[PDB]
């Protein structure tokens, strides 16, 4: 633990529209970096109650908090005190569009987020319009190098209220301000949590576990 | 003439982040809407000079100032004095996606229009990032009724230095904030042409033409 | 006219699978390849009647049949005597994707097309399993050219049963199987219409026009 | 099971086209289905020796062989005597499609399938055509229940020559031609190798590991 100490806060700066909406959101967030456990409250400070499902946000609030083997390279750490940025796509399959880019810093114990959300084309009596999305299931994001960059997809499901699932597809692009050493084809599992939150979900609390490996059969 | 002269002025205030890069736009723009004749000038206010190419922000500076035959259904001038929105995905062929939303209102002579504009996975050697593209070919968008909405769908192809072409497929979904009588299955053509800039196209001039009308064989 | 004549006409042998379906069919077509007139009728020869709609191979049964200006190069009919092959590619809105390969040869006055038709993905409950498709709607093709083929993009869409439309993306690659001249970036519009059929779709008659084009405004 | 014995053998039966060119393939299977481990040797019977990468085809030659635990329902495995069948979606990431279409049937200690495969859009100078793929990275399927159908969803990658990696999204929907217990959201994991062949692949000898988990962080 060089640059990264064991025990780490953060700050989110979070501000963007959904079908138009315009919205800010702030969080602190607290964890341990290299035990892949993480914590987060949040602030809708701009234009609250959100007229839209939480859940789609709550992926934009963290890869520093994630649990590396030593014999896998771990790029986002890597990165500081320089830090990195990421961009991600999110594809519905109802044909709602997120395009989402972060910029992470770090000063002394603590990381700073600032986070730019952008989505549209959800459908006004579709599942996020309509608040009927109940978390995301645990995910596995597959990783690879290339071009000095770290890519990562996923196939993410939203549970709905009644029964079955609401399909995302994310592909996250990590890119580090500096070289680093890159890492060879892996995985991190994840499982994100609404762990509190107050009746117009104005106020959110979550709560991450990820960590890497490499695959399960080989 | 209902709510719309027969000679119109507009402002542009753009707004967004390509690849993490902030930027802002402001417009002044004139025309003659039911003649489907249309320039504007454009100032990068904020963030220039861009590191990319103006031609990806160039269709997110007009939708009033199309020319409409009496026998299709004029959606978007329908909905005025109350105004529209529209939505957009842009997705080209190396990965790049972009997300765009606007909001159309009118004060007397004049347009208002608010665009917020998010891009992202643009390969940094590639047409956009190394401003390699000669701007947009003529295009024809097909569009339909549903939901009380108007959606646009386009093949566009930014023309290359040294030949060739680099492909972009637009979605736009057209959204007026009061019901309005819907058009028939149409298509609209348009020539989008920059008539001037300065050299790092930190100021742009341009021009565009567009027409509706009903399948050409039919 | 070289190798092709003012009147033509041509066989077609189709055979392939929808969601695991087995189908056979068989057509006789005659035209006016410089005009971009023609007609064919269809018999399905094995797997019939056929549990999917019939809009589906419609336009699986002929591009030497397109008008072209003088001023704009014919991909397709330079390619003859040696002929060409197409491959397309299907995406329907709720899900289902299609591949398409075909192979065009000429003999005397006779073009010979073998068609191979790979369909997947179509809901049970679908418009296409429920056969409750209308035709599709004229319909404009994007053409460009790359690596010596002719590319070509089309916003397809069926008309449904009770009013709206079920969308489709067409991409056809065309490949002469020797160099020819390439032309510029243009369009072909079409029409293609059931003009008869009986009962159960197992004898089928349609009509196609096509034209090429410059961009309308330009 | 009383259907299926801890001991199976299969026949693969396929055929299809890959860019135009027909090929048909026999195979012989054995495998432990209750211990997910499985072998398969393929004789190319037409159409060889194959101009393409031997890669694209290794994973269209059997789900009874995923190893499940007792706390999942085996969607595949319950399907028989039955059966079922599978449609797969192949998106490339330098635009090739393929859709493959699977028949699978029991007859006492023998699985049979039937496979029709179609592929296209492979760029000439690409790792398939002029294969430069050495086989593909051991994966991770995201399953899940919807419509009595079981969704495969797979972020697939092939080795290249040199290095790096070349992409391809696997879709994958099982349908059991009965009603059976429908699992959770699940994965299968896993490792496909080529162990051995002859000079130009008309011969290949495959190993498959098949194991299906509860999400890792969970």
Redesign the interface.
């Known amino acids: 633990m060089s640059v990264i100490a064991t025990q780490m806060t953060y700050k989110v700066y979070m501000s963007?529209?959904v079908?138009?909406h315009y919205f800010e959101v702030e969080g602190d967030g607290k964890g341990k970096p290299y035990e892949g456990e993480q914590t987060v409250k949040l602030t809708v400070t701009k234009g609250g109650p959100l007229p839209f499902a939480w859940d789609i946000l709550s992926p934009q609030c963290s890869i520093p908090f994630t649990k590396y083997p030593e014999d896998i390279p771990d790029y986002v750490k890597q990165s500081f005190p320089e830090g990195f940025?990421w961009?991600?796509?999110m594809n519905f399959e109802d044909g709602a569009?997120?395009?989402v880019?972060n910029?992470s810093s770090i000063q002394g114990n603590c990381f700073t987020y600032h986070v730019?959300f952008?989505?549209?084309?959800f459908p006004?009596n579709g599942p996020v319009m309509q608040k009927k999305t109940q978390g995301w299931?645990?995910?596995?994001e597959?990783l690879?190098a290339?071009?000095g960059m770290l890519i990562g997809?996923n196939?993410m499901?939203l549970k709905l209220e009644g029964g079955?699932?609401y399909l995302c597809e994310f592909?996250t692009?990590y890119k580090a301000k500096k070289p680093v050493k890159m890492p060879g084809?892996h995985?991190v599992?994840?499982?994100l949590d609404v762990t509190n939150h107050n009746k117009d979900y104005t106020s959110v609390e979550q709560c991450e576990?990820?960590?890497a490996?490499k695959?399960?059969?080989?």
Chains 1, 2, 3, 4 share one sequence.
């Open positions: 963007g529209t079908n138009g940025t961009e991600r796509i569009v997120c395009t880019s910029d730019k952008s989505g549209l084309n006004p299931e645990p995910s596995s597959r690879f290339r071009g997809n196939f499901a079955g699932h592909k692009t084809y995985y599992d994840r499982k576990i990820s960590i490996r695959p399960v059969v080989a």
